[PDB]
C-alpha cells in the first residue's frame, strides 16, 4: 500500500474576502469665507496631522498584524512541536 501512506490532499480550500474596504472621500468646501475671502488666518492649518494619522494607521496595521504574526508563529512553533514529536515518533516507529 505505497500510496495511501502519504495522504496527498490540498487543505488549501479556504477563501478570505478583502471586501469591506470603503475609503471615505473627504469633500471639504475648499473655498475660504464667502467669495475670495474676508478672513484668512482662521482656516485650520492642521490636515497634514490627518495624513500623518493616515501613516499612524499604516504603522498601526504593520504593528497590529504582527502583534498577530508573532502570534500565529508562536501557535506555529507549538504546532511544530507536534511535527517534532511526529518526526521523532516516526524515527521511533521505524526503529
Amino acid at each position: 500500500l505505497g500510496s495511501a501512506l502519504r495522504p496527498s490532499t490540498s487543505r488549501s480550500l479556504y477563501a478570505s474576502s478583502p471586501g469591506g474596504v470603503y475609503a471615505t472621500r473627504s469633500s471639504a468646501v475648499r473655498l475660504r469665507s464667502s467669495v475670495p475671502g474676508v478672513r484668512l488666518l482662521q482656516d485650520s492649518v492642521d490636515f497634514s496631522l490627518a495624513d500623518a494619522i493616515n501613516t499612524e494607521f499604516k504603522n498601526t496595521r504593520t504593528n497590529e498584524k504582527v502583534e498577530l504574526q508573532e502570534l500565529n508563529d508562536r501557535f506555529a512553533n507549538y504546532i511544530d512541536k507536534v511535527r517534532f514529536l511526529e518526526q521523532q515518533n516516526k524515527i521511533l516507529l521505524a526503529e
Binding site: T9, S12, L13, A15, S17
Partner: peptide, 11 residues
C-alpha cells in the same frame, strides 16, 4: 461582491 472564497475541495 459576496465572494466568500470557500475552495471546493473535491476530496
Amino acid at each position: 461582491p459576496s465572494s466568500s472564497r470557500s475552495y471546493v475541495t473535491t476530496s
